[PDB]
Amino acid sequence: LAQCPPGDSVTVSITSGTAENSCTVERKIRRKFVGREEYLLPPIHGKQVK
Amino acid sequence: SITDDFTLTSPYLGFCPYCRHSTPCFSPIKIENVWDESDDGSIRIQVSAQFGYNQAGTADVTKFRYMSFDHDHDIKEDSMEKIAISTSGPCRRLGHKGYFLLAQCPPGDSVTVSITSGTAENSCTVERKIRRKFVGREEYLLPPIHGKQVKCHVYDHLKETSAGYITMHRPGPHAYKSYLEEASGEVYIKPPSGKNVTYECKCGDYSTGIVSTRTKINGCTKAKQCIAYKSDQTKWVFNSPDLIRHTDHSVQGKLHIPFRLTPTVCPVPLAHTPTVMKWFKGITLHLTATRPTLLTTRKLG
Amino acid sequence: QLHYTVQEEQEHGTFVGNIAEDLGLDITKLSARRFQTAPNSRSPYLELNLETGVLYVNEKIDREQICCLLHLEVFLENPLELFRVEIEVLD
Amino acid sequence: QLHYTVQEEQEHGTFVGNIAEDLGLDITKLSARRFQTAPNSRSPYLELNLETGVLYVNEKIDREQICCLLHLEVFLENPLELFRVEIEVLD
Amino acid sequence: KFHTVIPSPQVKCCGSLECKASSRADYTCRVFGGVYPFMWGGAQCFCDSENTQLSEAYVEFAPDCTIDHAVALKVHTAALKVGLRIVYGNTTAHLD
Amino acid sequence: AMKPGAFGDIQASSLDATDIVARTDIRLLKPSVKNIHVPYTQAVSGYEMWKNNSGRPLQETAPFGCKIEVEPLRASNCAYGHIPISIDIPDAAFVRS
Amino acid sequence: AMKPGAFGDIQASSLDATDIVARTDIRLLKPSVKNIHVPYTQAVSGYEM
Ligand SMILES: *[C@@H]1O[C@H](CO)[C@@H](O)[C@H](O)[C@H]1NC(C)=O
Ligand SMILES: *[C@@H]1O[C@H](CO)[C@@H](O)[C@H](O)[C@H]1NC(C)=O
Ligand SMILES: *[C@@H]1O[C@H](CO)[C@@H](O)[C@H](O)[C@H]1NC(C)=O
Numbered sequence: 001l002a003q004c005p006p007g008d009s010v011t012v013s014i015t016s017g018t019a020e021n022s023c024t025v026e027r028k029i030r031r032k033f034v035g036r037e038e039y040l041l042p043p044i045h046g047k048q049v050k
Numbered sequence: 051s052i053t054d055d056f057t058l059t060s061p062y063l064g065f066c067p068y069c070r071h072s073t074p075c076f077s078p079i080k081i082e083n084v085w086d087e088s089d090d091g092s093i094r095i096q097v098s099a100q101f102g103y104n105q106a107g108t109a110d111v112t113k114f115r116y117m118s119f120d121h122d123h124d125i126k127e128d129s130m131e132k133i134a135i136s137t138s139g140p141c142r143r144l145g146h147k148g149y150f151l152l153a154q155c156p157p158g159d160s161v162t163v164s165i166t167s168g169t170a171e172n173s174c175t176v177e178r179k180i181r182r183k184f185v186g187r188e189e190y191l192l193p194p195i196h197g198k199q200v201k202c203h204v205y206d207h208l209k210e211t212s213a214g215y216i217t218m219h220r221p222g223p224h225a226y227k228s229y230l231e232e233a234s235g236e237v238y239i240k241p242p243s244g245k246n247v248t249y250e251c252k253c254g255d256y257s258t259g260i261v262s263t264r265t266k267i268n269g270c271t272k273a274k275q276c277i278a279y280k281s282d283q284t285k286w287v288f289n290s291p292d293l294i295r296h297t298d299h300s301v302q303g304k305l306h307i308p309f310r311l312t313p314t315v316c317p318v319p320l321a322h323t324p325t326v327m328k329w330f331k332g333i334t335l336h337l338t339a340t341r342p343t344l345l346t347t348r349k350l351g
Numbered sequence: 352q353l354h355y356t357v358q359e360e361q362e363h364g365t366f367v368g369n370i371a372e373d374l375g376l377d378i379t380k381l382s383a384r385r386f387q388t389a390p391n392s393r394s395p396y397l398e399l400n401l402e403t404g405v406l407y408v409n410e411k412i413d414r415e416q417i418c419c420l421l422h423l424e425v426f427l428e429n430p431l432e433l434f435r436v437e438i439e440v441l442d
Numbered sequence: 443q444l445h446y447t448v449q450e451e452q453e454h455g456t457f458v459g460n461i462a463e464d465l466g467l468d469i470t471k472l473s474a475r476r477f478q479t480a481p482n483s484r485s486p487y488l489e490l491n492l493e494t495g496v497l498y499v500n501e502k503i504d505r506e507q508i509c510c511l512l513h514l515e516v517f518l519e520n521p522l523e524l525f526r527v528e529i530e531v532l533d
Numbered sequence: 534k535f536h537t538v539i540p541s542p543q544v545k546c547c548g549s550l551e552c553k554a555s556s557r558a559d560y561t562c563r564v565f566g567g568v569y570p571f572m573w574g575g576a577q578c579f580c581d582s583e584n585t586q587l588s589e590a591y592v593e594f595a596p597d598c599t600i601d602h603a604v605a606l607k608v609h610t611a612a613l614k615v616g617l618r619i620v621y622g623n624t625t626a627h628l629d
Numbered sequence: 630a631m632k633p634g635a636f637g638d639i640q641a642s643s644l645d646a647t648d649i650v651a652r653t654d655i656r657l658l659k660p661s662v663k664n665i666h667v668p669y670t671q672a673v674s675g676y677e678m679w680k681n682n683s684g685r686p687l688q689e690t691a692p693f694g695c696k697i698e699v700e701p702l703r704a705s706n707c708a709y710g711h712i713p714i715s716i717d718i719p720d721a722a723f724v725r726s
Numbered sequence: 727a728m729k730p731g732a733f734g735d736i737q738a739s740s741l742d743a744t745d746i747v748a749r750t751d752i753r754l755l756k757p758s759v760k761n762i763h764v765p766y767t768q769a770v771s772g773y774e775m
Contacts, residue, residue, distance in 0.1 A: 299541065314480050535674060605640075
């Protein structure tokens with residue numbers, strides 16, 4: 001379970017092991033919203049909706 | 051009466067809306083203002099911590115001072131190379147002075163200032179829309195090697211130059227709840243390491259006192275009906291929205307805003323010369339431009 | 352926005368802080384308002400009683416695995432509210 | 443581009459370089475043309491005299507060498523021109 | 534471009550607060566009762582739920598207005614002044 | 630006569646003047662969470678809004694093909710009319726027939 | 727009959743021929759800065775267009 005920036009692919013890799021390998025798949029993920037106003041980051045003062 | 055003596059000033063804890071764990075938190079590095087008015091893409095950032103100064107307050111490059119998270123709140127120092135600035139990728143740091151950074155950043159929708167590794171490793175992110183800027187009438191990703199050298203305005207990299215000032219005030223109470231100790235039906239003021247602490251209680255009436263050791267409060271049964279905070283805190287703090295003001299909120303001092311916007315010369319591209327075809331009462335211009343280039347025509351009548 | 356402290360290597364089930372008392376919430380209506388730990392902020396070293404609203408040490412605290420602060424979030428219904436708790440660990 | 447050498451740990455105020463002589467500019471015209479350092483490229487170790495156009499040591503040369511070379515920029519008006527000066531540090 | 538100054542909030546622990554008129558640019562003021570402010574350290578007042586908060590807000594000039602600013606002008610009837618070169622016979626005179 | 634979100638929303642006699650007047654549409658909101666921030670909403674900067682859609686300057690939109698210059702404000706080299714000119718030629722310039 | 731910015735702006739009988747002919751609108755400019763580079767502007771490749 002990860003928190004990822006928007007992108008058009010998903011990559012899982014082993015950075016420095018003996019295996020030293022990566023796997024990349026095509027997956028379109030974008031930013032998701034809760035309300036009727038766009039926001040890059042959740043604001044301090046809000047409405048606290050479900 | 052703008053002063054440069056930072057021994058009279060102290061950093062503070064702000065309320066950052068986006069921390070390392072993606073939720074607002076109290077942070078020693080809180081982004082107050084971001085200015086992007088220079089023509090070379092450099093930005094000036096106001097941070098709740100002070101850079102270029104040591105723990106005591108003297109001028110010391112490669113040291114920055116900040117506010118600790120402990121209950122006996124004091125001012126700590128750390129080395130400067132772990133201060134990182136980013137918008138979408140890493141940002142080059144062009145200069146630093148107390149409360150202020152000057153950086154060169156790629157375009158992005160947010161501004162992040164982080165303390166990387168060590169103790170107090172954290173970050174602060176603010177929604178700030180900055181974009182690539184231009185000087186002339188031709189777009190360019192990079193400054194051209196052969197151009198026109200037109201006048202533009204950039205932020206001065208010298209920290210001695212000043213763009214204005216910020217007001218500095220005496221700090222208000224902070225009211226740490228760890229100074230309070232609940233006992234079997236009574237409360238005690240518990241100052242840390244003998245530092246003097248003022249308490250205001252509403253036991254059955256408003257009572258104010260100053261103690262230096264652990265002191266019983268006679269009328270109060272719960273810790274939530276009284277508060278206590280450190281006394282003798284004569285260190286000027288910037289007028290920030292995340293701090294309760296003192297009873298006397300007069301302007302105690304002024305601090306320079308470094309990296310003033312200064313005129314200079316800077317090159318702009320010269321586009322390809324168009325081919326002109328003439329026909330009776332008209333011309334045809336054959337236009338070639340890799341980047342968007344502005345063309346203007348007007349009649350002389 | 353809540354400030355709490357714990358000691359280094361503290362025993363399981365020991366007192367940390369009374370969330371319901373510090374927020375001024377009534378004690379007899381935690382279950383009616385659905386007091387619950389926020390799923391975004393889950394701490395393996397901390398656990399809170401739903402009935403009493405008292406935070407407790409769940410697993411034994413270790414700075415080497417942690418390092419710093421411990422972050423937790425609670426949410427309440429009717430009305431929908433969110434609260435944040437931050438814990439400092441001594442050495 | 444106009445690069446030239448400076449010794450390690452050179453004293454403050456020692457002669458370092460001559461911008462005006464290498465560019466064919468006289469003292470009076472550069473005084474009239476506002477011969478100033480460009481605000482982008484500035485170094486704390488070097489300063490120019492505003493009327494003679496001579497770079498000299500401001501702060502003593504040390505080993506961190508910013509990143510490596512020393513870079514400086516100057517600009518003039520009527521006509522608007524920008525000039526770059528590069529400085530080698532002999533360790 | 535204006536710079537919006539939000540001063541440090543005033544908090545008075547269960548005692549009424551009100552704010553007076555100010556000569557500051559676009560001074561907007563509002564007082565909120567029944568607050569319970571928190572900072573890093575714990576609660577900020579000794580009083581349960583009658584605490585009041587006074588919030589201030591105004592605007593001033595941005596630090597970079599010394600360069601990026603606009604000037605508004607009302608202009609009247611314009612007068613034309615010309616530079617003339619007059620050659621009479623074989624004598625040349627330049628004038629305005 | 631300031632208007633929120635338009636040009637001239639903040640005005641002063643000079644940049645260093647203390648008698649600044651503005652009518653930006655600023656309003657203070659009740660604090661939702663129990664921190665010590667001040668929540669507020671404001672209209673956009675009318676100066677920035679004017680910069681976004683200022684159109685073209687008079688250096689590009691001016692009749693008779695003459696160029697606008699500042700300090701002082703003027704329009705130089707305009708070719709639009711006819712000027713009657715009277716010259717009192719000195720008699721030393723003339724020669725006999 | 728070469729034309730700048732259009733197809734056939736450069737022509738030859740073969741890819742290895744030395745009798746290459748072209749009419750790409752090359753404009754050599756006066757060097758502005760005090761260096762040795764050759765500043766020039768050119769029409770876009772008509773083959774790419
Ligand atoms: C704290 O304040 C008290 C007020 O009576 C003063 O006497 C004392 O010197 C101060 N300083 C300490 C205890 O360090
Ligand atoms: C004008 O011309 C006459 C005859 O050609 C000559 O004698 C005289 O010197 C000239 N005057 C001037 C001012 O050049
Ligand atoms: C205003 O600015 C936005 C983004 O800054 C831009 O997309 C837009 O074209 C501008 N003009 C108008 C008339 O909206």
